[PDB]
Design a protein around this ligand. Sequence first.
Ligand SMILES: Cc1cc2nc3c(=O)[nH]c(=O)nc-3n(C[C@H](O)[C@H](O)[C@H](O)COP(=O)(O)OP(=O)(O)OC[C@H]3O[C@@H](n4cnc5c(N)ncnc54)[C@H](O)[C@@H]3O)c2cc1C
Ligand SMILES: Cc1cc2nc3c(=O)[nH]c(=O)nc-3n(C[C@H](O)[C@H](O)[C@H](O)COP(=O)(O)OP(=O)(O)OC[C@H]3O[C@@H](n4cnc5c(N)ncnc54)[C@H](O)[C@@H]3O)c2cc1C
Ligand SMILES: Cc1cc2nc3c(=O)[nH]c(=O)nc-3n(C[C@H](O)[C@H](O)[C@H](O)COP(=O)(O)OP(=O)(O)OC[C@H]3O[C@@H](n4cnc5c(N)ncnc54)[C@H](O)[C@@H]3O)c2cc1C
Ligand SMILES: Cc1cc2nc3c(=O)[nH]c(=O)nc-3n(C[C@H](O)[C@H](O)[C@H](O)COP(=O)(O)OP(=O)(O)OC[C@H]3O[C@@H](n4cnc5c(N)ncnc54)[C@H](O)[C@@H]3O)c2cc1C
Lengths: 379, 379, 379, 379
Amino acid sequence: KHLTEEQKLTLDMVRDVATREIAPRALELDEKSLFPEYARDLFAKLGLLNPLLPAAYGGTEMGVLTLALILEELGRVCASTALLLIAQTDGMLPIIHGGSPELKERYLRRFAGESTLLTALAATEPAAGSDLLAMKTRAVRQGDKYVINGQKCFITNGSVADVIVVYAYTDPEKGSKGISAFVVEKGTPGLVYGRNESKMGMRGSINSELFFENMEVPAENIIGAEGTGFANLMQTLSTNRVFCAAQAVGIAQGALDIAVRHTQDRVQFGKPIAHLAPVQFMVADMATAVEASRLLTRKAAELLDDGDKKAVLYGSMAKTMASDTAMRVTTDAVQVLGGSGYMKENGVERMMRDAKLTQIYTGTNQITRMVTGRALLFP
Amino acid sequence: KHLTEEQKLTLDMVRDVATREIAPRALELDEKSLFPEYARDLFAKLGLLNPLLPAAYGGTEMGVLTLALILEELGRVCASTALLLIAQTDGMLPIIHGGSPELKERYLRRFAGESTLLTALAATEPAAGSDLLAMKTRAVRQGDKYVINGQKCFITNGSVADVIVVYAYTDPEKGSKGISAFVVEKGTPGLVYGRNESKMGMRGSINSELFFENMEVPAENIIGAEGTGFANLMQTLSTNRVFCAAQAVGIAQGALDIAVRHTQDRVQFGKPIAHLAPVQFMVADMATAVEASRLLTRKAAELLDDGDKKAVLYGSMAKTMASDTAMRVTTDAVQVLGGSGYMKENGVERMMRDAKLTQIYTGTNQITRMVTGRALLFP
Amino acid sequence: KHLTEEQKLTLDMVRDVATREIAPRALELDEKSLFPEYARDLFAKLGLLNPLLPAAYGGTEMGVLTLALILEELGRVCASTALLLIAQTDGMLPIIHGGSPELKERYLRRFAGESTLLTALAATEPAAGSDLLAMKTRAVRQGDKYVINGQKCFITNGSVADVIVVYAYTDPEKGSKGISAFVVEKGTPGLVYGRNESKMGMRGSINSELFFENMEVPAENIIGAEGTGFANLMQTLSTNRVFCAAQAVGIAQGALDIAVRHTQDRVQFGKPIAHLAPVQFMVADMATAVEASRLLTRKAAELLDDGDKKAVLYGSMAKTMASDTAMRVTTDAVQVLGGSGYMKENGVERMMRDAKLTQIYTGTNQITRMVTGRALLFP
Amino acid sequence: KHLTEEQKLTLDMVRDVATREIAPRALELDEKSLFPEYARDLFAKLGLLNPLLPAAYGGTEMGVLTLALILEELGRVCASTALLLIAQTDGMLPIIHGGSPELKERYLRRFAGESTLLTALAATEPAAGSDLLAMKTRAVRQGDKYVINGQKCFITNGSVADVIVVYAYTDPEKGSKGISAFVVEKGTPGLVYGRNESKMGMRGSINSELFFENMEVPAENIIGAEGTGFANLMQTLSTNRVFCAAQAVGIAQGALDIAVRHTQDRVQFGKPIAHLAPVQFMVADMATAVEASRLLTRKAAELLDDGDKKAVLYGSMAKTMASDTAMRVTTDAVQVLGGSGYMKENGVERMMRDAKLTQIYTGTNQITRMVTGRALLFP
Ligand SMILES: Cc1cc2nc3c(=O)[nH]c(=O)nc-3n(C[C@H](O)[C@H](O)[C@H](O)COP(=O)(O)OP(=O)(O)OC[C@H]3O[C@@H](n4cnc5c(N)ncnc54)[C@H](O)[C@@H]3O)c2cc1C
Ligand SMILES: Cc1cc2nc3c(=O)[nH]c(=O)nc-3n(C[C@H](O)[C@H](O)[C@H](O)COP(=O)(O)OP(=O)(O)OC[C@H]3O[C@@H](n4cnc5c(N)ncnc54)[C@H](O)[C@@H]3O)c2cc1C
Ligand SMILES: Cc1cc2nc3c(=O)[nH]c(=O)nc-3n(C[C@H](O)[C@H](O)[C@H](O)COP(=O)(O)OP(=O)(O)OC[C@H]3O[C@@H](n4cnc5c(N)ncnc54)[C@H](O)[C@@H]3O)c2cc1C
Ligand SMILES: Cc1cc2nc3c(=O)[nH]c(=O)nc-3n(C[C@H](O)[C@H](O)[C@H](O)COP(=O)(O)OP(=O)(O)OC[C@H]3O[C@@H](n4cnc5c(N)ncnc54)[C@H](O)[C@@H]3O)c2cc1C
């Protein structure tokens, strides 16, 4: 838990940036459904866009715990801006962890330093959500190339990513041993963009359909050996869950902060409503659940940094509890503001809308409860 | 519970209208923040706009239970269209219940038959939400007129109502015995409209600030005697809560219906997800909570029709439970649809947004729990 | 819902008996683990021991709704005394509903009038709880007799019943079409009693292991045709669930009544704690959940009386919600009494102990949620 | 968090003792309502009876975190044995923290080393539970002595303690500045024992009424200055809450352990029930809540060791969440064992009974939520 002085200075800069730059922009980002371009460009200049890019490739190579602390601070003021960092890191992790030395040099170097290029991870399909093994995208080797046919949906930053990691069957009969992962570059012929689908929340973020129409990628773009794609995806999922837990902790904290401030300022029955025993009770339950969620998430993030095998269990616990907490706390934070909490100008209704996604993405809370229960019952 | 054949035919017409006319319009009503003019005009032609207007004034004079059944059917497909009927009835109840024979003839006759004119109830102020006795609008008698100064906020249909019931202090020192209620007509000099504030949900509905700047209303427009306004407001609140409970039952049912249909159609892991034990469990809890809420609401509505004093207790129980149920069921209905549930085109995210208001309006669930607990502990 | 004057007078007598006779005995019944012999003998004299015994066999033949109302009143003051009536009725239902005219005359006549004889239902085995089809008791026809070998556990009143309905495989390979039901009389050679197992609550009740060691019952004792036993068991289960729901409503109400009384009498901080906003909130939630549970249970009981097929769905909803409500309300009723609520002399701790069983017996709340969800998803 | 090698060896010994010595005795301790004399005598020989007694007085002087880790291990197998350590430490803390050097030497030396003498804290009265300022015990100085008149209830180990800390008004008009704390020795004339009241759980523990009838204690026995008693009590409460949180974490873990083991062994529907998605879900929620509770408690215990002022806030959060978690997890652990979970021989029903007390003692969860909410809203 002893943060290095590099971790402490980074997070002091992140808190200052979240407060002064990200927060004043959050309402317009949601209202107008804007990509957070200003934040992306600033994060690139500050070294915050690619936190987990290794130093070998010009990156800052902070730990998982540092990123989790950063996501909590950004989630407090703008869930969409936190999602940018989550998507960017998740799009890069399959290459960092399974790519050959040649593949990592060829595709990670372009993200060095202050690069503003974007990544994406393309696994989910209309036929394959929780049942990832039902994905229908196919990769057929033909000489020195793979031919990719299929489609993907719900791909964060899909249509704007310079590098997409695409999961596809190379042997459709081997199931979990028949999937592969491929680097796909923006501009590849046969890569076609669909709708940017309109969402309840996280509106400051791009949500892409992708289509592959005889898309030829060079045979060197496979990440690892044929048939290893599913394990590669599963290894990144443990990390993605912690990032979604940390974002949900931030959302919950940000909504609590606004509710706490309102109880101190809002006067009914002759004194601030913070003097009312039931308001005090709601705030107590909210904060207790936020802090519990924060402790779980920070523990899981440290286990990941330590390469500990128990990170899967505690990451799944943190993801479930943090996101359920964000949903419950934001729902009650709107309640604490009364009618004003239902008004768009006051922010908490957006945080409630943002919070619902964290119970679904990186695996629904039903899927994660199964990951947690199976790890406990079949250790 | 034995519905008359007039009740049964009315509700068969309402279900047909909800399905064929109201539901296909709900997404655009929310997306574009439209007043439900088509529904208003149709309800007027069918005799559904003013259900509680007495037959003496050209009205249909259905019971509270019939309206509650109608609100459940409309809430199932469009919460905003249900809110139109709630606002219209609530704006009329103070006159129906406290108005002199002369006042009722003078202001209720214009709502007879197929009239499309609108009402509103103006009690809430920025300084007075749950603490209604802190309202600052003042009514000063001057000869044959009252002079009204002050303001109101969150007034449903406030800026489009032909008749507004305005609550104001005539003796600011007598507290709950110093408030009066006044009929205020559209076009009165000194009646000024503010913002239509933008909301998280119930977007197909007008939400008005009102200002009174030396507004002169004739002395005949007072509803009852001076100082009786607070009791008049309290008597309408018991009825408003039942209407909000019934709307929340409808919202919850409509979201459950969509989730139920999705589990039957959505195939993951080789069979429809309805075959999955945890999906079955969520649907069981959702439906159980909806039916419990429906039974409470129908009981409270019958007690109101019977003039039973225990309607306050059971109306407050139904309001609390129905609206908490709508919040929980819509939150889980989005969960049951996975990623697709987070997409605006699929409706349930709007129902989740609509559901949050029912925990706040007609009195927050904190205020209602106090009404319930006080009635039980101090009978 | 319109109770007959016979229903109203019966329930006025039951309330008087519950208050004056059953309640003062409840603490000793639990403390000393006594069979409620006094209540059994009194119920027999008043015609309350065998409510569902048909008039054709000397019985009172009240409906399911009347018994459900009786169980609520008894559950309010002594869950163990309510369980006597539940066990007695459940032991009789398989014969009433599936027995031939000859079998019903031969075994139901002994329960006519003021008979104090007892019944029991023996289905559950150590290997077969929720998975009833795994039961291992076997019935082999040999000439004019069936030979019964096997065992049963958790049999309420098992060791004291004059007539036990025993479920057993006659064709172990046909699963749900290979079970039969048999009348077994006290005193049959080869019927052996095991432990009366010691329980957390419902201590005023006998909980028997049964063993069948080449037990010969005459071939006329089969209830219906061979292979119909499972359907017979399933038909009684719908009724048993409603009875357990009604008992749980009573438990919850009885605990609420004590907590309500305590808030009125217990003075802290200068006034009764009923003046405290959070105590008011707990009591509101408790009572709302009790009334919802009561409405569900009464609806399911009426559907059963009407022979409506939807009784399975609403009986499973009432059972789940009523028993979860009894658990939550009794847990909070102990909380409302503070330290005194943890003391055995004050009753609510026993009601909390009693309440936990209702979430388990007549099918666990996990099994019932599946009955509810399957009925909704596969109608 | 880095445990010293003395902490690690102590907790390895505690786990071994809990498993081999404490756990096999837990069922009889509850069944027969026995004081844990064997455990007390063994803890004394191992240096575990007085963990927080300073080294200056012959004690081991482990931290709060070490004791909290010990209480978790003992709470896992016997809540009553954990309560012995909690009561013993709490009875000593007022002297350790507020006593003059002379008073600490005079009364703490007798607890050095392997002493088996017992302490108690006597604050609560029938008229003063949460409202401690309503206590009526009075201390009147008369020459070189104080005369103590009054009574106390719910005093753990009250009737067997060699040293009792008694809180009493010395100036009944100064409220929170008019209470004092006094050392009271077993054998003082005028100290009279009442009932050992019979409880729902924690039955292996003594629960005493105390009466003071012109009880003369020497004037040197006052702990601190007159009027400082309330602050002394409040300072110990922060520590007591953490100890009750840690005990509740242990209870919850112990019940989860039994449920986890049962799902692995209990076969229904052809395979262990651990293969069932809903059982997996319950175990996931249970374990997540246990680990969250454990993290909160360990954080609060470290803040106390660091003398950090934020320990009050996090201790109140841990106490609320840990005890609510013990109640919910034990309630579900009984559920996971089915009928067998309701049987006394299987332990979890006792853990459920034990768990309910942790929501009440050291301050009810209503009082603690107020401590948490006030600290957040009025920092
Ligand atoms: C806005 C958004 C961004 C996302 N970003 C990415 C991205 O960048 N790249 C990417 O590849 N994916 C992304 N995801 C995919 C996301 O993680 C999925 O939606 C999720 O994995 C579930 O898929 P589904 O929506 O089809 O739900 P379904 O699998 O259809 O689930 C429907 C319901 O059934 C339940 N269910 C399903 N299976 C089971 C089971 N076996 N047991 C019990 N319950 C079950 C689920 O919990 C859910 O409640 C994103 C999704 C969204 C909506
Ligand atoms: C969209 C909308 C439509 C509405 N329509 C109408 C309308 O047509 N006409 C009209 O006159 N009004 C209308 N209402 C008013 C509405 O009912 C109020 O918002 C509600 O009565 C609460 O007022 P408030 O928002 O100021 O909340 P506040 O009173 O500020 O409450 C803030 C928070 O404190 C809690 N709280 C407040 N007092 C207490 C207490 N004593 N004990 C415990 N907790 C407490 C509340 O539960 C809430 O969580 C509408 C409101 C909205 C938002
Ligand atoms: C005091 C008492 C009185 C009773 N009286 C009678 C009586 O008079 N006569 C009689 O025949 N029986 C009686 N019952 C039997 C009772 O109904 C059962 O205990 C119940 O049916 C469950 O059986 P089990 O205890 O073996 O639990 P199990 O079936 O072992 O269940 C263990 C856990 O797994 C869960 N589970 C099991 N299967 C599934 C599944 N498919 N999906 C999800 N979760 C699952 C359960 O919910 C439970 O949480 C009584 C039981 C008790 C304890
Ligand atoms: C078995 C046992 C052991 C204990 N051991 C010790 C001991 O060793 N020494 C000692 O001095 N004490 C001890 N305690 C005392 C214990 O902490 C109290 O019972 C507790 O402090 C509450 O007091 P009460 O039971 O009178 O509850 P009450 O104060 O009567 O509370 C009744 C209910 O009202 C609620 N309530 C009370 N005040 C408020 C408020 N202001 N706002 C909202 N809700 C409120 C409470 O939460 C509770 O639900 C013990 C108690 C027990 C039962």
